[PDB]
Design an enzyme around this catalytic site. Structure first.
Site, mmCIF file in Angstrom:
data_model
loop_
_atom_site.group_PDB
_atom_site.id
_atom_site.type_symbol
_atom_site.label_atom_id
_atom_site.label_comp_id
_atom_site.label_asym_id
_atom_site.label_seq_id
_atom_site.Cartn_x
_atom_site.Cartn_y
_atom_site.Cartn_z
ATOM 1 N N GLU A 150 0.863 -1.180 0.000
ATOM 2 C CA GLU A 150 0.000 0.000 0.000
ATOM 3 C C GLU A 150 0.897 1.227 0.000
ATOM 4 O O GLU A 150 1.513 1.567 1.011
ATOM 5 C CB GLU A 150 -0.897 0.016 1.240
ATOM 6 C CG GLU A 150 -1.838 -1.163 1.290
ATOM 7 C CD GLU A 150 -2.698 -1.228 2.550
ATOM 8 O OE1 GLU A 150 -2.401 -0.516 3.547
ATOM 9 O OE2 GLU A 150 -3.682 -2.018 2.542
ATOM 10 N N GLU A 291 -6.375 -8.127 0.015
ATOM 11 C CA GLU A 291 -6.799 -8.108 1.425
ATOM 12 C C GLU A 291 -8.246 -7.674 1.489
ATOM 13 O O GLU A 291 -8.649 -6.740 0.803
ATOM 14 C CB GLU A 291 -6.000 -7.084 2.245
ATOM 15 C CG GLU A 291 -4.502 -7.297 2.262
ATOM 16 C CD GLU A 291 -3.727 -6.273 3.058
ATOM 17 O OE1 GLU A 291 -4.361 -5.527 3.834
ATOM 18 O OE2 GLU A 291 -2.481 -6.248 2.907
HETATM 19 CA CA LIG Z 1 -3.302 -2.756 7.367
#
Ligand SMILES: [Ca+2]
Length: 363
Positions: A150, A291
């Protein structure tokens, strides 16, 4: 496997969370966040539950040596390889990434789109991926490399276009560097994200670009891709991730509107995932929702697990609908605000109904 076949084979995935990405004061250590050292038995238990892919977050941080070689500690690479083998030797798909290193908020985080020394960041990144790729060059297409996790500047608003260009540059460097190592690295699937793994900022007109792959194996058909696109999904956050009891229910089966979000329901999930299908899947890029999940709020609302199950089923089923891979976020924590489905201390299942919900969603 081509782009359609690989998604089928990957099934439902599971993250080996809070292990090899765990780090304190810059040094990775798979026990640093309270989970035990990973053993093959855990991975066998996850396989027995029906998951077909394992995502393995990996941080490097101060295990990367000084410039110009940026040599990765050999013992660390050997450990990562052992853990990969626990899954790979069981016939599972496996994803390995560079995880903590891309965060401003992590001590030692250096893969920073906002960082001032982009030349050094890019060279370090190249040298690090050269080494990881070389270590795993003989692994077949069940091993996937993911460029980074990320990656953003910390701001949840619209991405800075110059910083997005740096992100795109990292993805391009990753692809070309991996391909020019040996073995099967010129042919394997490579997973890349856009800004902060955010769907809207990846599909919209904010600066994401698809990498070229001109160093890839000649054996890959011109008309096919060997790149996949990553996004993460925890919406609406007030339900899924915010660590309080304000919102403890989700979806149509919620029994109390005061405990349910006012947005982010089944209609939103549909729009979001359809946007990834329309932008990427239709162009021949598999999508991995690397995720997703919701935290344990049973300490606030004794019915919360009904909704964690409903949410997990809905996200899994929506991924299945739109021909993309859903990968559950399991951090090993069983308790307040936890994501775990297994107790890693004894390889027991702790959330059978959520596992069942995921597997129902794959029908
Ligand atoms: Ca996280």
């Amino acid at each position: 496997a081509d782009a359609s076949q690989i998604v089928s084979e990957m099934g439902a995935g599971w993250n080996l969370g809070n292990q090899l990405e765990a780090a304190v004061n810059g040094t990775p250590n798979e026990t640093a966040w309270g989970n035990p050292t990973v053993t093959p038995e855990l991975i066998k238990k996850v396989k027995a539950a029906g998951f077909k892919s394992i995502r393995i977050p990996v941080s490097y941080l101060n295990n990367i040596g000084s410039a110009p070689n940026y040599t990765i500690n050999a013992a660390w690479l050997n450990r990562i390889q052992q853990v990969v083998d626990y899954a790979y030797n069981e016939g599972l798909y496996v994803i390995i990434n560079i995880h903590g290193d891309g965060y401003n908020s992590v001590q030692g985080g250096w893969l920073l789109v906002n960082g001032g020394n982009q030349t050094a960041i890019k060279e370090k990144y190249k040298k690090v991926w050269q080494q990881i790729a070389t270590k795993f060059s003989n692994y077949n297409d069940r091993l996937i490399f993911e460029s980074m996790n990320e990656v953003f500047d910390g701001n949840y608003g619209n991405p800075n276009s110059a910083y997005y260009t740096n992100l795109n540059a990292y993805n391009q460097i990753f692809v070309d560097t991996v391909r020019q190592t040996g073995g099967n690295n010129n042919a394997r699937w490579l997973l890349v994200p856009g800004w902060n793994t955010n769907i809207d900022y990846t599909v919209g007109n904010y600066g994401f670009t698809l990498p070229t792959d001109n160093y890839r194996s000649s054996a890959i058909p011109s008309s096919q891709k060997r790149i996949m696109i990553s996004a993460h999904y925890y919406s609406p956050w007030d339900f899924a991730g915010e660590e309080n009891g304000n919102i403890t229910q989700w979806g149509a089966t919620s029994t109390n509107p005061a405990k349910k979000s006012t947005w982010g329901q089944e209609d939103y999930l549909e729009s979001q995932f359809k946007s990834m299908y329309d932008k990427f899947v239709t162009q021949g890029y598999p999508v991995v929702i690397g995720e997703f999940g919701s935290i344990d709020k049973t300490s606030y609302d004794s019915s919360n697990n009904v909704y964690r199950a409903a949410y997990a089923k809905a996200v899994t089923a929506k991924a299945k609908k739109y021909k993309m891979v859903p990968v559950y976020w399991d951090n090993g924590h069983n308790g307040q605000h936890g994501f775990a489905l297994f107790n890693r201390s004894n390889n027991t299942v702790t959330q059978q109904n959520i596992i069942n919900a995921i597997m129902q969603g794959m029908q």
